[PDB]
Design a binder for this molecule. Sequence first.
Ligand SMILES: [Zn+2]
Lengths: 68, 43, 76, 87
Amino acid sequence: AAPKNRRSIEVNRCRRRNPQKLIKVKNNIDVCPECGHLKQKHILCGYCXXXXXXXXXXXXXXXXXXXX
Amino acid sequence: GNEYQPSNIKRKHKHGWVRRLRTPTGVQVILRRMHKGRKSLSH
Amino acid sequence: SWTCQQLRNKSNEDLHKLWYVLLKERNMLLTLEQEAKRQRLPMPSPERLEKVVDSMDALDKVVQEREDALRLLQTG
Amino acid sequence: XXXXXXXXXXXXXXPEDTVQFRIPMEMTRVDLRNYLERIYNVPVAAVRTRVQYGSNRRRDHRNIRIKKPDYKVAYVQLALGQXXXXX
RNA sequence: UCGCACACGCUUACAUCAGUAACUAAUAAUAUACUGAUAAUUAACAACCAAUAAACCAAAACAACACUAAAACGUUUAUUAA
RNA sequence: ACCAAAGCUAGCUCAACAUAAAUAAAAUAAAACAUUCACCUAACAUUAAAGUAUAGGAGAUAGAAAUUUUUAUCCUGACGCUAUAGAGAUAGUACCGUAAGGGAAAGAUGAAAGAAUAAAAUAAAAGUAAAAAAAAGCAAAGAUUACCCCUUCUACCUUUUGCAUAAUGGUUUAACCAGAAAAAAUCUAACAAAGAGAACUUUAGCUAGAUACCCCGAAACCAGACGAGCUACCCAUGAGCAGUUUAAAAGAACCAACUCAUCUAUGUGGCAAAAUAGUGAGAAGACUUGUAGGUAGAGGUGAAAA
Ligand SMILES: [Zn+2]
């Protein structure tokens, strides 16, 4: 099918703004119990964990290379 | 498919410069091409 | 100037024994030039190279015009 | 001016009696041998020549496709007892 | 699962290094298919070459043979010459 | 304030001067068409003869000749135009087509980068800023509040007897874009039985000036050439077509490659301007295919379907 007529500005605004509610803002922000950095709720920190996971990955690769 | 089957030998023989020289009408073709200021008399 | 200085001095053998040496020198000089440019390194001595180019063109023009003079002399 | 030398450019390793050169396209191997023998005073055992077609590049200002000048390269084998090393 | 070599062709796409806000591969990852600069293998491989004049009958089908549709390419001798 | 307009300069048109051969048509006009047709191909100066003598389906129209009159150079530009105008041209390039051929778009800071001097920031488009109390609206006006509800009204244009019409055209904005011919006449002036710059008219004429007759569009015709790298046929030279049952059988039938496209489904601005999946035919023959060639439009080819 094809549009009968061109859309007015008002209809476009009312359609693209109100019903979609834009982006609903909740609070995901929580302070890390360890380093005190701001991170997401119900989730592990992105500071004191990713570095320890990379150090654990390097230690696992070094142990796997030393065992072989 | 397509109507085009590229060949260099056929192109150089048929559309070539020597072929244009062998016929007076071809000389007229080169003539009008040089009159139009074509940079290439042959593709 | 330099061209005229070459033309006023008349030697048949010495000329080739000169500009062939300068040409074979330009060969190695432009060789080092090309090897420098293709090595992704700046030109160590562009000035001397340009001077060698201009001088080689000059001497080649001298030999050319001298040969032209000789041929014109033998023709007429 | 017609010829030049290239050593550290080629990735192929042939330090023993093998030298690489850029030559003119019209010059035959024999004339190259004689020229290299008489002018630079060195013996030449063999000559192997090949033609390198020039790469092309466009120009956006005039909207015109252009091509770099074609080249020809040669590989000379000299007399025994010589080693070519250059940077 | 279906593809490696020979081409007619196709006119540096490719290999290395460097840089990717931007364009370029409908995005990212990145890059054999982006920018910039710099590398681009030989030959006994493939193209390019003797003039003529004579001799001879009974096809090819892993073919003594047979059949039909009455037979892609083949050799020898002599002269001149490079 | 955002995409944006606005600020200059190349560039050219035209006039003048200098310097291996051989009757082309047709569309069209005569509102059909058939004799006919200013014109165009090359030579062809002014005034007057003259739109006359003649010619012509005596239709349209075509149209002289005899004869007449004429004149020395030196003195250059614009009441022509600017990026939609003037050449297409910062170029016959990029790009398209096998080819002949067709043919574009494209620059601005300042005296000096010495890179923050400028001066407006208003064209169509969304951001600074959405509809708002149980209300109807070809989109406004009269009232009313610094906003709105209520009351009063059937878009424009084109085509038509008649359209808000469910007849036509338009997304919006900018820009571009389609009435240029004086005979007789009316009128303003010169002179007057004469006017008018050696040419014509004339019982108030004659001379000069000023007033009315716009564009786009075919299907086709003719001429000169380009096209058999698609496809149709053919010439020359090469290559290809497992396996199984079998009485001698390149012999029969089945069945992979390859060559075809029976049926169904999917796909329907697509994977694709002829497809994919399943299935089906030929598959030693009138078979398939590579390369090198030949045949074209007052035709060729065609196991023949216009
Ligand atoms: Zn943490």
